[PDB]
Paper text:
At the core of this natural phenomenon lies a fundamental process of energy transduction by luciferase enzymes that convert the chemical energy stored within the ground-state substrate (luciferin) to an excited, emissive state of the product (oxyluciferin) by a spin-forbidden process. Although beetle luciferase systems share identical substrates and chemical reaction sequence, they emit a range of different colors from yellow green (λmax ≈ 560 nm), which is typical for common firefly species, such as the North American firefly Photinus pyralis (GPp) and the Japanese firefly Luciola cruciata (GLc), to orange and even red (λmax = 590–623 nm) from certain click beetles and railroad worms. Here, we describe the first crystal structures of two rare WT luciferases from Brazilian beetles that emit light with exceptional colors; a luciferase from the head lanterns of the glow-worm P. hirtus (Coleoptera: Phengodidae), the only known luciferase that naturally emits red light (λmax = 623 nm; REPh), and a green-emitting luciferase from the firefly A. vivianii (Coleoptera: Lampyridae) that displays a blue-shifted emission relative to common firefly luciferases (λmax = 538 nm at pH 8; GBAv). Biochemical and structural analyses of the two luciferases, combined with computational modeling, provide the best insight yet into the relationship between the structure and color of light emitted by beetle luciferases.
To identify structural features that are important in the color tuning mechanism, the crystal structure of GBAv luciferase with a blue-shifted green emission of lmax = 538 nm at pH 8 was determined for comparison with the REPh. The GBAv crystals diffract to a resolution of 1.9 Å when free of substrate and crystallize in a space group P212121 with two independent GBAv monomers in the asymmetric unit. The structural integrity of loop is maintained by interaction between K524 and the backbone of G528. The ionic interactions on both sides of loop fix its position relative to the enzyme backbone.
Residue numbers in the entry: 5 to 544
């Protein structure tokens, strides 16, 4: 019981019905207020209203039903971020058809693998994805129909959404009389792609139950965004990412104006943030490093900007603080989660921002930190392995029971593979690694930097660096190294290589050990303690 950390009750009691039913209810409301904007394309300036989105979604839902799609079918969406992206997604959710968002820049192998897993009957794609989709269709006969998202009429012999609708929808159809289907909450809502360290991406099977819980969080005044009229958000998260899907769908539930970009550009981003008077900006992790460097932020009027949020992994405390200062904010709105957990399971509570913290456990969820050795449940300010448990946890990997049971134990705990601790206020901190610095006698800093140096070497494929401690005084930097295919190196060559890369005898002082693979990914990064043992055992 103790050391299990629980989220509080939701602010609002749970709505009834599927994700389609709840989504339909909100969209129908916003649709009847003319001029309410759902999506805005920053590159061409075009707006699409909730009225337009709602009507298209209902038409697509009934059209797909008439076409013959049922609970047993899936559709895929393959496209750059666009105004039309979520139209077939809303429609599919209305009728319980699973949706597989598919990376538009997948190579031929990755694309085939993704669609091979989701097995869609219809693929909605942009003009820019048509050729690659045509190619994969030759290999995947389950794909019976291709529909073009960003064309009004037929394009290259393929139907547009409008033409598809015209063929399969009677002229008696009234969008405001349409009623979404009712079905079991364990019905598949999405198949999202996620890669650990193990080769190719797997299919993450998210249920309607998963999604409606996200719908609770998204409009929660503490753990989401309070629904307020004329709220706009600029998002540069790929819609086919887990957090891209879960944040964007949530914004639709909230009735927000979602400003999107096909591709990130500094000027256009800042100009749009200013001119659309967005209250929030949602960024991918690597863009925080970017804006920490940006000098242009001050030259724009961002007086309406209330928050900058990370739509992905947790961020470094210093990078976050630097970006906060750039945008004249007290802190960054953060969240920790996995594709496998639908969305963020730990979120910065509104008005309760601690620097370096990824926030607090969300409603309906539980979290625990376990001893890296004993598996023992830990108290506050004790670093260990982070586990997550709750109703946003995926049904499982598609057709991969083994991978599922390796990640999720029999009681529903997800083994995140990340190291963390929580403080006395139950704020969680994700630590990247387990330590972070090996100390000479006074100081030396060789974490990821030495690893990066090692990775650049032609003969070196992978590498992990840890500190080796012994009664032999102090702490010596050491590394395990994965050589390339059929290549030869000595310990000295690796050491001398690093020696000629940094100063102060902070270049491997313990000893290099060659291995077949870097200790542990366990679906994530480097197992620092595993590395320490292997190197320690080697020293004698």
């Amino acid at each position: 019981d103790k050391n299990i950390i629980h989220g509080p009750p939701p602010f609002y009691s749970l709505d009834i019905g599927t994700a389609g039913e709840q989504l339909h209810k909100f969209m129908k409301k916003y649709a009847q207020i003319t001029g309410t904007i759902a999506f805005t394309d920053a590159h061409n300036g075009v707006n699409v209203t909730y009225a337009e989105y709602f009507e298209m979604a209902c038409r697509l839902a009934q059209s797909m039903k008439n076409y013959g799609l049922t609970l047993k079918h899936r559709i895929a969406v393959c496209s750059e971020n666009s105004l039309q992206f979520f139209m077939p997604i809303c429609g599919a959710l209305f009728i319980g058809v699973g949706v597989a968002p598919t990376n538009d820049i997948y190579n031929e192998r990755e694309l085939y693998n993704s669609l091979g897993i989701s097995q869609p009957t219809i693929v909605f794609c942009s003009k820019r994805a048509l050729q690659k989709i045509l190619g994969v269709q030759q290999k995947l006969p389950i794909i019976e129909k291709i529909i073009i998202l960003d064309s009004q009429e037929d394009f290259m012999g393929k139907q547009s959404m409008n033409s598809f609708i015209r063929q399969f929808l009677p002229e008696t159809f009234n969008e405001y009389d349409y009623v979404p289907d009712s079905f079991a909450l364990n019905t598949t809502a999405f198949i999202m792609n996620s890669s650990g360290s193990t080769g190719l991406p797997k299919g993450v099977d998210l249920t309607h139950q998963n999604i409606v819980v996200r719908f609770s969080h998204c409009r929660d005044p503490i753990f989401g965004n309070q629904i307020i009229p004329d709220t706009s958000i600029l998002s540069v998260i790929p819609f086919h990412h887990g957090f891209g899907m879960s944040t964007t769908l949530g914004y639709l539930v909230c009735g927000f104006r979602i400003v999107l970009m096909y591709r990130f550009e500094e000027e256009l981003f800042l100009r749009s943030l200013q001119n659309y008077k967005c209250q929030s900006a949602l960024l991918v992790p690597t863009l925080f490093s970017f804006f920490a460097k940006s000098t242009l932020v001050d030259k724009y009027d961002l007086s309406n900007l209330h928050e900058v949020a990370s739509g992905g992994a947790p961020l470094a405390k210093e990078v976050g603080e630097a970006v906060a200062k750039r945008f004249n904010l007290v802190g960054i709105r953060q969240g920790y989660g996995l594709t496998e957990t639908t969305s963020a399971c730990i979120i910065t509570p509104e008005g309760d921002n601690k620097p370096g913290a990824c926030g607090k456990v969300v409603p309906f969820f539980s979290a625990k930190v376990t001893d890296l050795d004993t598996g023992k449940t830990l108290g506050p300010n004790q670093r260990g392995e982070l586990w997550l448990k709750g109703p946003m946890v995926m049904k499982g990997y598609v057709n991969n029971p083994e991978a599922t049971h390796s990640l999720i134990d029999k009681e529903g705990w997800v083994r995140t593979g990340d190291i963390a601790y929580y403080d006395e206020d139950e704020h969680f901190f994700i630590v990247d690694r387990l330590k972070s610095l090996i100390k000479y006698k006074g100081y030396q800093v060789p974490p990821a930097e030495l690893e990066s140096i090692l990775l650049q070497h032609p003969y070196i494929f992978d590498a992990g660096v840890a500190g080796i401690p012994d009664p032999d005084a102090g702490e010596l930097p050491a590394a395990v190294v994965v050589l390339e295919e059929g290549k030869t190196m000595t310990e000295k060559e690796v050491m001398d290589y690093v020696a000629g890369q940094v100063t102060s005898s902070k270049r491997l002082r313990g000893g290099v050990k060659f291995v077949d693979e870097v200790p542990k990914g366990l679906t994530g990064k480097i197992d620092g303690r595993k590395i320490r043992e292997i190197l320690l055992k080697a020293k004698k």
